[PDB]
Write a protein that binds this ligand. Structure first.
Ligand SMILES: *[C@@H]1O[C@H](CO[C@@H]2O[C@@H](C)[C@@H](O)[C@@H](O)[C@@H]2O)[C@@H](O[C@@H]2O[C@H](CO)[C@@H](O)[C@H](O)[C@H]2NC(C)=O)[C@H](O)[C@H]1NC(C)=O
Ligand SMILES: *[C@@H]1O[C@H](CO)[C@@H](O[C@@H]2O[C@H](CO)[C@@H](O)[C@H](O)[C@H]2NC(C)=O)[C@H](O)[C@H]1NC(C)=O
Ligand SMILES: *S(=O)(=O)c1ccccc1S(=O)(=O)F
Length: 218
């Protein structure tokens, strides 16, 4: 996240860190005690058997007793297009079930086909790059963004920060877009580089996949 602010500890207890060798590389969302969702391109060309699913994290540089760590058991994708980044969503079944508490919670998703119009106010979040030559963030970041429909495909939800250069960046991919308490997006791609102030950020449209998601997580 470029141009945001520190999230307060465990403000978003559905926020997930996907890690290789103890290293964050993508975000995700807890959508059931034993399932997370993230972007498909995050687990493409990656050894998924080595990926750790980290719940209850806040600071990537500290030892955190609030964490619960799982592994990936099953993978579900529904027509993911690696060229056009269509259907850039993956569901990952965990090798166990999370203990639901104050710091680890299941996100709420919208109804199937639910659409957000221009101007709606949302919150993006993630541990991604803080800016050019600044590296990924230790502390979970959040960013007020606004839904836009210009420069956006009907198969995405797109957002832009008005008035300054801000947006999601490398490392934020897979992270939830939250609008009115519901997860409407999964960070999918940027254009013209991160925080260009010109191209909106693109999210996988979670609402278009709700029936499919439910048929898996029941
Ligand atoms: C910046 O965003 C915060 C947080 O946004 C709301 O909550 C998110 C989780 C998500 O659901 C968004 O779609 C929501 O817009 C805003 O804080 C809200 O602020 C109002 C007062 O203006 C307050 O009554 C609400 O309780 C706040 N909600 C939360 C969860 O804190 C804030 O207003 C936004 N500010 C700007 C300038 O964009
Ligand atoms: C689910 O998979 C995780 C991933 O390894 C298991 O977690 C570890 O738990 C063992 C206990 O046997 C510890 O020795 C390791 O240090 C843990 N690893 C990490 C990275 O935390 C977990 O036990 C599995 N749960 C079930 C129910 O199978
Ligand atoms: S991801 O958040 O879409 C992302 C953003 C900015 C640069 C690269 C990436 S990546 O595709 O995950 F690498």
């Amino acid at each position: 996240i470029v141009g945001g602010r520190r999230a307060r500890p465990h403000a978003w207890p559905f926020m997930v860190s996907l890690q290789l060798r103890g290293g964050h590389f993508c975000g995700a969302t807890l959508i059931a005690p034993n399932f997370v969702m993230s972007a498909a391109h995050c687990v493409a060309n990656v050894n998924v058997r080595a990926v750790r699913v980290v719940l209850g994290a806040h600071n990537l540089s500290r030892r955190e007793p609030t964490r619960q760590v799982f592994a990936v058991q099953r993978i579900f994708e529904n027509g993911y297009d690696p060229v056009n980044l269509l259907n850039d969503i993956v569901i990952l079944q965990l090798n166990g079930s999370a203990t639901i508490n104050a710091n680890v919670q299941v996100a709420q998703l919208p109804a199937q086909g639910r659409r957000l119009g221009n101007g709606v106010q949302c919150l993006a979040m993630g541990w991604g790059l803080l800016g050019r030559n600044r590296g990924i963030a230790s502390v979970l970041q959040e960013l007020n963004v606004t839904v836009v429909t210009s420069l956006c495909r009907r198969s995405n939800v797109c957002t832009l920060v008005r008035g300054r250069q801000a947006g999601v960046c490398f490392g934020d991919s897979g992270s939830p877009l939250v609008c009115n308490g519901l997860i409407h997006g999964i960070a999918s791609f940027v254009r013209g580089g991160c925080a260009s102030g010109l191209y909106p950020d693109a999210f996988a449209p979670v609402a278009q996949f709700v029936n499919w998601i439910d048929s898996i997580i029941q």
